[PDB]
Amino acid sequence: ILEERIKGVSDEANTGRVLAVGDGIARVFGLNNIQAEELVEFSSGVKGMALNLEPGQVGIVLFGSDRLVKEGELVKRTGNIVDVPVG
Amino acid sequence: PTEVSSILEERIKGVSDEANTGRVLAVGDGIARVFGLNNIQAEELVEFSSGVKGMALNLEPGQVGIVLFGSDRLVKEGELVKRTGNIVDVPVG
Amino acid sequence: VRYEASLRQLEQRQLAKSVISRVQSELGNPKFQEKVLQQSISEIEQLLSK
Amino acid sequence: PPVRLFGVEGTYATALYQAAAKNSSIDAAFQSLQKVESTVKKNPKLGHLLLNPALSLKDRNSVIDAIVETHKNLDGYVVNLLKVLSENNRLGCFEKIASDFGVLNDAHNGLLKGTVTSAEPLDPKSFKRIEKALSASKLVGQGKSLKSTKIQKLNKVLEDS
Amino acid sequence: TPITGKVTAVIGAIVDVHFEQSELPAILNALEIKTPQGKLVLEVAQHLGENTVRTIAMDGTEGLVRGEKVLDTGGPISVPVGRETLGRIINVIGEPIDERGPIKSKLRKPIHADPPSFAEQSTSAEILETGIKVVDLLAPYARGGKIGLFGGAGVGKTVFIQELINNIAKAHGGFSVFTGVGERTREGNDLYREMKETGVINLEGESKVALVFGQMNEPPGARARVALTGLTIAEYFRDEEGQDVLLFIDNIFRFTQAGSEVSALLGRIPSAVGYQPTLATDMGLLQERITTTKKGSVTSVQAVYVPADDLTDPAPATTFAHLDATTVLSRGISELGIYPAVDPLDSKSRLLDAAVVGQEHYDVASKVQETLQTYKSLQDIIAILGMDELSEQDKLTVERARKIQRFLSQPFAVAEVFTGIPGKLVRLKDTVASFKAVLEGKYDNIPEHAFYMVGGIEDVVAKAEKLAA
Numbered sequence: 001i002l003e004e005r006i007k008g009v010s011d012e013a014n015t016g017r018v019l020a021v022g023d024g025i026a027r028v029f030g031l032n033n034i035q036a037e038e039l040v041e042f043s044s045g046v047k048g049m050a051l052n053l054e055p056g057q058v059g060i061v062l063f064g065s066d067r068l069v070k071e072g073e074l075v076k077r078t079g080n081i082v083d084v085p086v087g
Numbered sequence: 088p089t090e091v092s093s094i095l096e097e098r099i100k101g102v103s104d105e106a107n108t109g110r111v112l113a114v115g116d117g118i119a120r121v122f123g124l125n126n127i128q129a130e131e132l133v134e135f136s137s138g139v140k141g142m143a144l145n146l147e148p149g150q151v152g153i154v155l156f157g158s159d160r161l162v163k164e165g166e167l168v169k170r171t172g173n174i175v176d177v178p179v180g
Numbered sequence: 181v182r183y184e185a186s187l188r189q190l191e192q193r194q195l196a197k198s199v200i201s202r203v204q205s206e207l208g209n210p211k212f213q214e215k216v217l218q219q220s221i222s223e224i225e226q227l228l229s230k
Numbered sequence: 231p232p233v234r235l236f237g238v239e240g241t242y243a244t245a246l247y248q249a250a251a252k253n254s255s256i257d258a259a260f261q262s263l264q265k266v267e268s269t270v271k272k273n274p275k276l277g278h279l280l281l282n283p284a285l286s287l288k289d290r291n292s293v294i295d296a297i298v299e300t301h302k303n304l305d306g307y308v309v310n311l312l313k314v315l316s317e318n319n320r321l322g323c324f325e326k327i328a329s330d331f332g333v334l335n336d337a338h339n340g341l342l343k344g345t346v347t348s349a350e351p352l353d354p355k356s357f358k359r360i361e362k363a364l365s366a367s368k369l370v371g372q373g374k375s376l377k378s379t380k381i382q383k384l385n386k387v388l389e390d391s
Numbered sequence: 392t393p394i395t396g397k398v399t400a401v402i403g404a405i406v407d408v409h410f411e412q413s414e415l416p417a418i419l420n421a422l423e424i425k426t427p428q429g430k431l432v433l434e435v436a437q438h439l440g441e442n443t444v445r446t447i448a449m450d451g452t453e454g455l456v457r458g459e460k461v462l463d464t465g466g467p468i469s470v471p472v473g474r475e476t477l478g479r480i481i482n483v484i485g486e487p488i489d490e491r492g493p494i495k496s497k498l499r500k501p502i503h504a505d506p507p508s509f510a511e512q513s514t515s516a517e518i519l520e521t522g523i524k525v526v527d528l529l530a531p532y533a534r535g536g537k538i539g540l541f542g543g544a545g546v547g548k549t550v551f552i553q554e555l556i557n558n559i560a561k562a563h564g565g566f567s568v569f570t571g572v573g574e575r576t577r578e579g580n581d582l583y584r585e586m587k588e589t590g591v592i593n594l595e596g597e598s599k600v601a602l603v604f605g606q607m608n609e610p611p612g613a614r615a616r617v618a619l620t621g622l623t624i625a626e627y628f629r630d631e632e633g634q635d636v637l638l639f640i641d642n643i644f645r646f647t648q649a650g651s652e653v654s655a656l657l658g659r660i661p662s663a664v665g666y667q668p669t670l671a672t673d674m675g676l677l678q679e680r681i682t683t684t685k686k687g688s689v690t691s692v693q694a695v696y697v698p699a700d701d702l703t704d705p706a707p708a709t710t711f712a713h714l715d716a717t718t719v720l721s722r723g724i725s726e727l728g729i730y731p732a733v734d735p736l737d738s739k740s741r742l743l744d745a746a747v748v749g750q751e752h753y754d755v756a757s758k759v760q761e762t763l764q765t766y767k768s769l770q771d772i773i774a775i776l777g778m779d780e781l782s783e784q785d786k787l788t789v790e791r792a793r794k795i796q797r798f799l800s801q802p803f804a805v806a807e808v809f810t811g812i813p814g815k816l817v818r819l820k821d822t823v824a825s826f827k828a829v830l831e832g833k834y835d836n837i838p839e840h841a842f843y844m845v846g847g848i849e850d851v852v853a854k855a856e857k858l859a860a
């Protein structure tokens with residue numbers, strides 16, 4: 001309990017962060033409550049999709065140019081599985 | 088001839104009297120990786136605790152790689168594996 | 181001969197199944213003689229190899 | 231030492247054992263390695279901040295140095311273990327380095343293996359033949375709840391015939 | 392008490408489950424994850440080491456979350472066997488999907504079971520007349536044998552099988568087990584309509600058939616399995632209730648295709664053409680089970696699909712050696728409008744032997760083939776030089792072969808909505824005589840067209856009189 005406030009490196013990260021991105025994929029760190037085939041939004045509003053979920057990282061397929069992502073970026077869940085307006 | 092079942096029970100009475108290795112790491116697709124079996128020969132026969140026999144083909148540094156003569160449903164991680172001390176061989180004549 | 185062989189083989193298989201069931205039931209009826217014999221066998225085997 | 235212990239992942243604890251085996255510095259390394267794992271696993275604080283692929287080279291080194299100055303047993307050669315794993319990106323597998331340190335002390339100053347049921351005694355005398363015989367008789371009578379190997383062998387022989 | 396794991400990994404149809412302590416579910420065991428829906432099934436494929444197993448899902452893995460609780464069911468996938476399943480439509484996981492309540496059988500059996508032993512084998516050479524000229528005559532099917540239909544897309548394996556169900560299954564008496572693997576749900580919905588109408592399936596009555604369906608919309612685990620469910624059911628009817636079982640699989644290709652679909656994610660180095668390295672033995676386990684044994688006869692027709700119309704693709708290549716009669720559909724032949732679009736030269740059967748069909752049927756066959764094979768040899772000269780460059784003997788053979796060829800075509804009742812002409816069934820004795828007469832040139836004076844798409848030799852003389860007016 002004494003080593004919690006003694007670090008000082010913003011220990012309050014709830015989302016995930018890009019570990020690496022290339023060739024239309026991005027390997028995100030975290031996103032622990034994510035479900036497979038769920039949508040994800042990146043720091044520049046580019047939508048990805050959760051392909052495979054391993055221990056440690058989530059493989060995410062980009063619905064767009066790779067340029068629109070950077071290693072380090074904050075990634076948000078949608079809670080939606082890939083979906084469209086209808087009717 | 089005169090109670091044939093009694094002759095088979097008397098001959099298979101005393102047999103198990105002198106039987107006192109590796110553990111399985113992972114098993115899948117006819118293959119079992121196995122930690123141990125240090126004295127084992129390349130191409131040696133091994134019995135798994137479950138009954139099914141196998142052959143050692145990849146004696147690597149950490150572990151041994153075994154092809155099975157059977158199905159594998161019957162082999163589980165950690166199950167004890169046993170040296171035969173023989174290379175695969177056949178009856179002849 | 182096929183019928184005589186089949187009958188003999190069925191009888192031997194039925195007798196083996198009944199013997200197996202009796203052996204399993206006896207071990208589950210806390211056997212004091214089995215527990216004492218298992219400790220004495222282990223000690224005798226280790227003294228012949230050392 | 232002749233223990234093998236893999237050859238790429240298991241060489242992390244074996245590398246520092248060579249420098250810690252001089253001037254009697256192996257005893258203090260056991261209790262110091264356990265404090266690094268315990269304050270990261272059951273703390274929820276520095277785990278999520280260090281397992282990510284962000285931070286920097288300087289940021290990872292400063293976090294390790296600040297924790298070690300207020301924790302039990304970290305002022306000798308313990309500070310150098312954490313620095314090596316920070317720059318080379320190996321802080322995610324801290325449980326593997328601490329586990330492979332303890333196996334060295336227990337192999338060159340004790341027995342290992344097992345026998346039946348639970349664990350054996352793991353004596354530190356000399357030869358394995360004179361140890362196992364004198365410990366088997368004392369552990370069979372005391373305890374031994376017995377909750378089968380001989381029954382399974384007999385049944386298999388009768389079904390194959 | 393219950394044994395529960397945790398979802399560590401999801402990749403496509405593969406789920407990795409970690410189990411807390413010691414007792415790891417056996418390979419091939421079913422696992423269950425409770426959904427908001429009903430439940431998701433999983434099949435333990437392998438032990439990865441370190442108390443983790445890797446499973447194949449029997450359904451979609453959408454929405455699975457890492458860390459999820461997974462229940463071990465302590466046994467292979469189970470399926471209701473015996474008379475209770477007759478006229479019920481079934482799952483891969485042996486469940487009722489015919490909106491008609493629980494299949495209240497006595498026993499549930501694993502789908503996985505070892506193939507009948509060698510001592511348990513049982514052979515015989517009994518013809519099974521089909522009413523199909525090409526087959527009847529050239530590659531006779533055998534009662535309790537293994538039949539297979541080979542062909543690429545849209546040549547007609549499905550319609551051909553429906554002609555066999557048409558004839559044999561009606562006047563068969565005993566039990567049938569139809570299995571839809573990787574085909575159209577339309578087709579399966581049609582087959583359920585088709586049975587209730589002939590009365591094979593009687594919702595209020597008794598029933599002679601059973602339906603199991605893992606169709607082409609299913610995930611690869613489902614489709615990698617659904618045939619084993621079918622089989623288990625048939626195997627009961629064969630071994631327990633000592634019955635003659637007719638067992639139609641369509642399409643068996645779709646089982647090996649599914650095997651490859653998952654195989655890389657199972658971590659395997661691929662093999663030639665990108666197939667699972669286990670393609671042969673995974674087929675041997677399944678094929679070697681569909682069999683007649685000393686306890687019951689099984690005749691089985693299987694539909695074989697042929698990727699890219701390539702017969703040497705490693706899926707069908709490996710199949711062949713598992714069949715007793717093999718009958719191939721050529722795309723080219725169908726483009727000639729010849730149906731059934733069989734290959735008179737590639738189709739085989741163990742039963743075309745004088746000891747079985749008898750010297751005449753034997754010889755009417757060979758001579759027909761020589762004729763066709765000769766026509767084939769000349770395909771090139773005729774392609775460039777045409778007919779005028781052929782000799783006299785050659786010239787005749789061609790006109791005759793082209794007649795034999797058209798005569799091998801037969802209207803099918805089931806395919807009526809494609810010919811227009813009401814379908815015909817010729818008999819074995821009927822076919823042989825008919826062809827023998829043509830091979831003795833007793834009809835040479837008849838326009839080639841007469842031989843096309845009609846029944847037996849009587850129908851030829853009919854149509855030729857019709858047209859000669």
Ligand SMILES: Nc1ncnc2c1ncn2[C@@H]1O[C@H](COP(=O)(O)OP(=O)(O)NP(=O)(O)O)[C@@H](O)[C@H]1O
Pocket residue numbers: 542543544545546547548549550551696730731732803806809810
């Ligand atoms: N014996 C036949 N008589 C008339 N038409 C046929 C016959 N066999 C096939 N056809 C035609 O060919 C088409 C495909 O036949 P079908 O029985 O669906 O073959 P399939 O090879 O099983 N196709 P698929 O299952 O998609 O790979 C049908 O629409 C029929 O018109």
